[PDB]
């Protein structure tokens, strides 16, 4: 156990209070549910409901409003090539991206299947920039994982992250029926910590260094009981 933390409200979304954690390093925290964001997974979306998510959860794939990823000049989703992970599936995008790759490439986006990432609500980043790191904890399983701020969600919803983060937290990772509405996940974000794409080894190390400086899981576990 650790001492309790001193908390100062900075925001509120969907009945979830977001608190700055007084002290250094600078951080904010919230306790929320955990919806599955399959964005960036190269098998999330395909024609005829072929992906791990239903196609329509990315929008209309017949030239209408498609938000799941990039589109061609006639508005249809880009299909992956023979050198992409899932040829013929659609390219699924995340807000955070790797500039080494082109807009039409799955490799530009953060693969939800492999990378632990959190989503923050649009207009509710609270000073965090895409690529910043976080420590995430599930109070019902005792599991934790470092993660990046990797995607942007609806402004009216909070508590969401990647397939791999769900696995690490022992939350059902299925895009179609997984996640949880129970407010069991505590997310500690370090705004200003990275703010760019870098290798997972590098950002994970930086998350580890910030977490050690901040007081570790022991402090976050105690903090969770305050939320």
Q: Which experimental method was this entry solved with?
A: X-ray
CATH number of the domain that 214 lies in? 2.40.40.20
Task: With CA atoms as reference, report the closest residue to 207 among 219, 218, 194.
Answer: 194
Number of domains composing the chain: 1
Mind giving me the DSSP string for 4-52? Answer: PPPEEEEEEETTEEEEEESSSS--EEEEEEEEEE-TT-TTS--GGG-SS
Q: Which domain holds residue 166?
A: 7-37+112-224
* Cα-to-chain-centroid distance, residue 25: 21
Q: Is 58 helix (H, G, I), strand (E, B) or coil?
A: helix
102, part of any domain: no
Buried b or exposed e, range 116-125, using 16+ CB within 10 angstroms: bbbbbbeebb
- Beta strand 117-121 with 144-153 is parallel
For residue 64, being part of any structural domain is answered with no
Backbone phi and psi for residue 205, each to the nearest 5 degrees, phi listed first: -60, -40
| Contact in structure between 34 and 184 (CB atoms under 8 Å) | yes
CA–CA gap between residue 162 and residue 173 (Å, rounded): 8
Q: Does 77 map to a domain?
A: no
Resolution value, angstrom units: 0.9
Tell me which residue of 150, 136, 135 sits closest to 92, measured CA to CA: 150
Would 207 be classed as within a structural domain?
yes
């Amino acid at each position: 156990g650790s001492h309790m933390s001193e908390l100062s409200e900075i925001d509120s979304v969907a009945g979830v209070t977001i608190y700055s954690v007084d002290g250094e390093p600078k951080s904010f925290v919230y306790k929320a549910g955990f919806a599955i964001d399959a964005d960036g997974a190269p098998n999330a979306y395909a024609p005829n409901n072929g992906g791990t998510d239903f196609t329509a959860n990315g929008g209309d794939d017949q030239g209408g409003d498609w938000w799941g990823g990039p589109v061609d000049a006639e508005g249809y989703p880009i299909k992956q090539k023979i050198f992409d992970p899932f040829p013929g599936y659609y390219v699924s995008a995340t807000a955070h991206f790797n500039p080494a790759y082109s807009e039409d490439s799955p490799y530009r986006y953060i693969d939800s299947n492999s990378i632990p990432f959190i989503v923050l609500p649009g207009n509710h980043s609270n000073g965090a920039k895409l690529g910043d790191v976080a420590l995430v904890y599930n109070e019902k399983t005792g599991d934790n994982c470092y993660a990046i701020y990797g995607d942007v969600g609806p402004s009216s919803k909070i508590g969401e992250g990647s397939v791999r983060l769900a696995q690490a937290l022992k939350i059902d990772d299925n895009p179609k029926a997984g996640g949880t509405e129970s407010r069991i996940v505590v997310t500690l974000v370090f705004p200003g910590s990275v703010g760019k794409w870098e290798t997972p080894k590098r950002w994970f190390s930086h998350a580890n260094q910030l977490t050690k400086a901040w007081g570790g899981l022991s402090r976050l576990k105690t903090l969770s009981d305050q939320l």
